[PDB]
């Protein structure tokens, strides 16, 4: 899982 | 769930034969075996793998993608067992140093022809137009095969020089794609010419082509060993031979190795191993499947020494030798999808060959990575927890205003925000009004937040020249710099706070589905 913070 | 095995295999394979091997295993062990053949199972498997089969059968090309995604168990065959199968079959199922499936059989396409309509099959693709002429005179056609899957048209495309990814010095170069080179254009052009000249119909699919050949309506088809059973039943006097040449060059089919992988999430991995090693990959197990729908040239030496005697298997392997083993890298999925689109569009007339293959060249190499969105600062455009696909950008490649980009904020954190200005753009806000290069620019993606705001303005007045990493003399965005803002403007920590970001921080563009399209 790659997460990106909005 | 637990005291049983669920197996997926494609609809064109010997699934009843495989079920008989499953019944033998149930007899011996009491463990029930259920064989299913879902439509587009190769796409569904990641969805469900959360459930999903204990064992999945597909050509080896898909498995590296499955393994990269952590969906497959590493298999643990001992030496004795590894020696029972041809070394090159093991090569097809190895990924990042590890064995990720049991190879079953080598598949290559051949030319299949009706000896009563056509005693001598054509040596060349170039003869087929004339030949169709002759055959149309008696209510027949020369050639029908599945145009909807690029597997079947690839041999012609690659004949004069097409390739997927160049394999060099022991590895594939994902940037070296051979889809829009001269060879590929000539092949696909010839295919489109056949359609333009009504020697083939663009809508011809697997079942239409198989029915036509098996009912004696077309003199030739292109298919794999699995198809031979139905032809036997039809009583067509058929031959299986080497594919014709194109521009003097042999057709070059992509060779698959039907392979059996074990779900990483399966609680029956030990039973799966037992079934595959000791029931399926035996002379008796393979025979049962093969008798239903032929497998091709099998991975098991002992049984292949028998099947290699068949002239049709000699033909299959001859076509294989002129082709090439498919890559198993995760990018293969994207390649096939790109090439499917290109063939379909060129054939239907939607695009010219150059257009189709130019787009395919791009799409086959474009790396796509899944991401999960965290936080509410892009709401409602993207939501907290939303899964998205992200198109990776090459180091110094074409970012544009409106693109939503993932970028490295620091060593640990990736952010996602919208590109509002690129290098060279003069930008400022006067309240909620965006001015780019002296022109107001509408922001339809803010429409909801503009109409459900807590304050007077959601973005508010600011000028690029006042932000960190900007040219303090100018609202023109510096070389290599980007202005990014979150769609949830009222709460977003973005360039208004931390300033312009650098081109080298950007990892990719988020892909969006548009709700509307043509029917
Ligand atoms: O057409 C793209 C498709 O090609 C191959 O799929 C073959 C498969 O290998 C054969 O066993 C047989 O079932 O026909 C399929 C084509 O309809 C690739 O293996 C597959 O990943 C790819 O999408």
Residue numbers in the entry:
A (entry chain C): 153 to 158
B (entry chain A): 9 to 57, 60 to 407, 409 to 530
Lines from the paper:
Bacterial type I signal peptidases (SPases) are membrane-anchored serine proteases that process the signal peptides of proteins exported via the Sec and Tat secretion systems. The type I signal peptidases (SPases) process the majority of proteins secreted by bacteria. They belong to a group of serine proteases that utilize a Ser–Lys catalytic dyad, which differs from the classical Ser–His–Asp triad found in most serine proteases and in the eukaryotic endoplasmic reticulum signal peptidase complex. The human pathogen Staphylococcus aureus has only one active type I signal peptidase, SpsB. Here, the crystal structure of SpsB, the type I signal peptidase from the Gram-positive pathogen Staphylococcus aureus, is reported, and a peptide-tethering strategy that exploits the use of carrier-driven crystallization is described.
As co-crystallization experiments with signal peptides consistently failed to show bound peptide, we modified the MBP fusion construct to allow covalent attachment of peptide substrates. The peptides used were selected based on their efficient cleavage by, or inhibition of, SpsB activity and were synthesized with an N-bromoacetyl moiety that formed a covalent thioether linkage to a strategically positioned thiol group on MBP, which had been introduced by mutating Gln78 to Cys. Two (Pep1 and Pep2) are substrate peptides with very different C-region sequences which are actively cleaved by our SpsB constructs. In the Pep1 and Pep2 substrate complexes cleavage has occurred between P1 and P1′, releasing the mature protein sequence (residues P1′–P3′). The SpsB construct used here had previously been shown to be fully active, cleaving signal peptides to release a mature protein and cleaving peptides with C-terminal fluorescent tags to release the tag. This implies that the lack of density for the mature protein portion of the cleavable peptides Pep1 and Pep2 is owing to enzymatic cleavage and not to disorder of the peptide in the crystal structure. In the Pep1 and Pep2 substrate complexes, the P1 methyl group makes intimate contacts with the side chains of Ile32, Met37 and Val76 in the S1 pocket, with main-chain atoms from Lys33, Gly34, Ser36 and Met37 also at a van der Waals distance. In this post-cleavage state the C-terminal carboxyl group of P1 is hydrogen-bonded to the SpsB general base (Lys77) and receives a probable C—H⋯O hydrogen bond from Cβ of the nucleophilic Ser36 (C⋯O distance 2.8 Å, Cα—Cβ⋯O angle 104°). The Ser36 hydroxyl points away from the cleaved peptide, which is the result of a clash with the C-terminus of the cleaved peptide.
